[PDB]
Amino acid sequence: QVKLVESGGGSVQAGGSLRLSCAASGDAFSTYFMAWFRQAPGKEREGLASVIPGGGHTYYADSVKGRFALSRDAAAKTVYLQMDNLKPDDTAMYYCAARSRGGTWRFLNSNDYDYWGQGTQVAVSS
Secondary structure (H helix, E strand, O other): OOEEEEEOOEEEEOOOOEEEEEEEEOOOHHHOEEEEEEEOOOOOOEEEEEEOOOOOOEEEOHHHOOOEEEEEEOOOOEEEEEEOOOOHHHOEEEEEEEEOOOOOOOOOOHHHOOEEOOOEEEEEEO
16 A cells, blocks of 8 residues: 655646645555546546556546646655646645556546545635
8 A cells, every 4th residue: 555645735826837746655656556636616526637657658637638747756756746827727625546456447536546645725816
């Protein structure tokens, strides 16, 4: 198992940039699918991006394509979500989640991830 701690939440003006990080504690960092989710007020948790072990490919939800970029630093056991051109509707609690076990499952579905961080909040002002 892996323990996840997100950082970087804060305020940003519309049109600005903000970067979130998640530090993963545990043995086999490179074996985990690592994903970012968000929960906006009064909506269900939305999957945003998922990196495949090896980082060779990364999937993005249509709502964040071209603006959000997910990366890994395996030596630092850290995953990063760079958000550019933020909009008021990106205001949400952001979560990082992880899964290593195989099988049949869906990469942007919150219900299929095993390990969760605590959340970090982003607020976009105008």
